[PDB]
Amino acid sequence: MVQVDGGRFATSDLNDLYRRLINRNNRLKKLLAQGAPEIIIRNEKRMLQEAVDALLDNGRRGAPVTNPGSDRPLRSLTDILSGKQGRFRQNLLGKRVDYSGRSVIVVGPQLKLHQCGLPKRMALELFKPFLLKKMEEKGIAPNVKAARRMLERQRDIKDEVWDALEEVIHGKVVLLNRAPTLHRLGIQAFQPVLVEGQSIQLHPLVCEAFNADFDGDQMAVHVPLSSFAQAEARIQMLSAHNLLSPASGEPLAKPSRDIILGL
């Protein structure tokens, strides 16, 4: 039961399902102490079963329990666990993640196969914790707390912080992903090249494995944090190290379109 922004209350449907249960149980206790006839005690008992039933799996047996003046079935424990929106397939086999971003992708012909264009403004957020430490080693900020305050206002950002970020991302890779991720090359690793501008630049040769075009496609960026993750990205996931289809064994990164045309 949480107060939202406006001071209003928002609450989970389970609270209403429990309340029905508690009310019916308590009334049953009272009817017993007062010696009600069996018809009355029987009605209460069968209503109690239904309250337990809606709590555990609402809609499973009989008409689904609803909040008043709404057709929406209350969301029971079974509904929470199961289905596309259920606990397993939503919060357990997949999650939202930190250190991630997204933008429109644009072709970057000048890139080497292991590279991508990464907007400087994106990299400053994605690498922000790393950037704070570097801003302390260089006298650029007194300490980590002060450095963060400097990045908060956009007019407070000076040019030495951009060089600091260049030092931070040195040799590190980022992950690019474009949905749908149909096979494992929907994610590949690239060493980022900071760019002005708000678009991610993708190498022409990887467009096929990603099924990426430039008609307005977007991609997601991820930062592997640990030495282990970074090692995994550069060895196993680097674009240049995956040149052949895991399916057919034929070349995946290969000439197409303009490249074929010119040659």
């Binding site: 009605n43 069968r46 209503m47 239904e50 009989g62």
Partner: peptide, 8 residues
């Protein structure tokens, strides 16, 4: 099958 109808 209908709890109300049953009680009635």
């Amino acid at each position: 099958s209908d709890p109300v109808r049953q009680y009635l």
